[PDB]
Design a protein around this ligand. Structure first.
Ligand SMILES: NC(=O)C1=CN([C@@H]2O[C@H](COP(=O)(O)OP(=O)(O)OC[C@H]3O[C@@H](n4cnc5c(N)ncnc54)[C@H](OP(=O)(O)O)[C@@H]3O)[C@@H](O)[C@H]2O)C=CC1
Ligand SMILES: CC1=C(O)C(=O)[C@@H](C)O1
Length: 321
């Protein structure tokens, strides 16, 4: 991992950019010559191979977090997988040539970077990155960080531990697919129940749900069964609180949270990915890609349009970048 030659790293590159808040179909444009970010001393520069989309990307571009956002214009994309090309002077965990992945923004809603992952190169804090598992493709790795870390953090906040039951609202999306897998295979849940629509129930069962509930045919909150943990990934805490055992815990990632449910926003940490590495290498926890993935870098508007439909099954990934 000797430094790259300095003239080998470009100062401009191709990226997707918006200059004003709005719908992605209106405001997201391709720019052939956007500055490559300069790295801070605790950052690395990554040659991007693949990036995932997350709902936060479009919600941020609508302006919903403007009061604590970074200045426009913005190059979107939180999730990245790629190869290190430059390391800052305080970096110790990575060298040039390492294959890495992570969610760029430590605090999703507070000062996310101006220079996201929908670009040929991006700058990332050492602390948000992990080494890419050798058995995962760059597409598979890029799909993981924001979603898997949100799933993990929510289950820790709900104090899930061996033998307990959990109900997942929204089992078939980017986050929910990892809630199911982590609950069963990492947290040792005795019973995992999850909601989705009719055609998605077999997927939930394949990922580790013992009980797949069709929300289009029945109301989970009216079941007599109550759970030690309820993890809402849809935004229906009013109902979620009716499905929890006395003394159990309800967490949500879509507010506002009706007490006793709590809302949190994840903290992005490479250490969480490193903790999960053995499950990813063994295949006990798998990436889940939407069948439309990958989208070429020319088709980022379309990729957002599909994510914005609320129907994605697992992750929407952009490759090759
Ligand atoms: N607070 C935080 O830290 C975070 C918050 N979020 C938020 O969490 C939410 C989920 O994110 P993510 O998983 O990436 O989103 P996705 O867009 O990937 O979720 C799509 C899935 O949602 C399912 N879904 C939609 N409505 C329902 C419903 N009523 N019941 C059950 N399933 C439903 C769909 O299944 P079907 O077609 O069967 O309806 C589809 O498979 C988003 O609002 C996002 O902004 C995400 C990450 C972190
Ligand atoms: C990551 C993230 C989202 O997707 C949200 O909507 C806010 C609550 O934070």
């Amino acid at each position: 991992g000797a430094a790259a030659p300095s003239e080998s790293i470009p100062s401009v590159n191709k990226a997707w950019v918006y200059s004003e808040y709005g719908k992605t179909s209106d405001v997201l444009k391709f720019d052939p010559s956007v500055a490559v970010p300069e790295i801070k001393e605790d950052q690395v520069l990554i040659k991007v191979v693949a990036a995932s989309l997350n709902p936060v990307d479009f919600k941020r571009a609508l302006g919903y977090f403007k009061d604590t956002d970074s200045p426009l214009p913005t190059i979107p994309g939180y999730d990245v997988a790629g190869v290190v090309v430059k390391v800052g002077s305080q970096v110790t965990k990575f060298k040039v040539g390492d294959e890495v992945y992570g969610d760029l923004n430590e605090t999703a809603l507070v000062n996310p970077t101006r220079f996201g992952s929908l670009a040929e190169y991006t700058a990332a804090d050492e602390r948000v990155l992990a080494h890419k598992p050798k058995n995962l493709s760059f597409i598979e790795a890029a799909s993981l960080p924001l979603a898997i870390e949100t799933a993990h953090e929510g289950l820790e906040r709900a104090e899930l531990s061996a033998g307990k039951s959990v109900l997942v609202l929204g089992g078939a999306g980017g986050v929910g697919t990892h809630i199911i897998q982590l609950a069963k295979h990492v947290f040792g849940a005795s019973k995992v129940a999850a909601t989705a629509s009719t055609k998605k129930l077999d997927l939930l069962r394949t990922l580790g749900a013992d009980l797949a509930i069709d929300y289009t045919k029945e109301n989970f909150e009216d079941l007599p069964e109550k759970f030690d943990v309820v993890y809402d990934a849809v935004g229906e805490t009013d109902k979620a609180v009716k499905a929890v055992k006395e003394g159990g815990k309800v967490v949500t990632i879509v507010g506002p949270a009706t007490p006793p449910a709590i809302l949190f926003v994840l903290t992005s940490k490479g250490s969480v990915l490193e903790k999960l590495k053995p499950y990813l290498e063994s295949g006990k926890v798998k990436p889940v890609l939407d069948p439309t993935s990958p989208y070429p870098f020319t088709k980022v508007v379309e990729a957002f349009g599909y994510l914005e439909s609320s129907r994605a099954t697992g992750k929407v990934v952009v490759y090759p970048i």
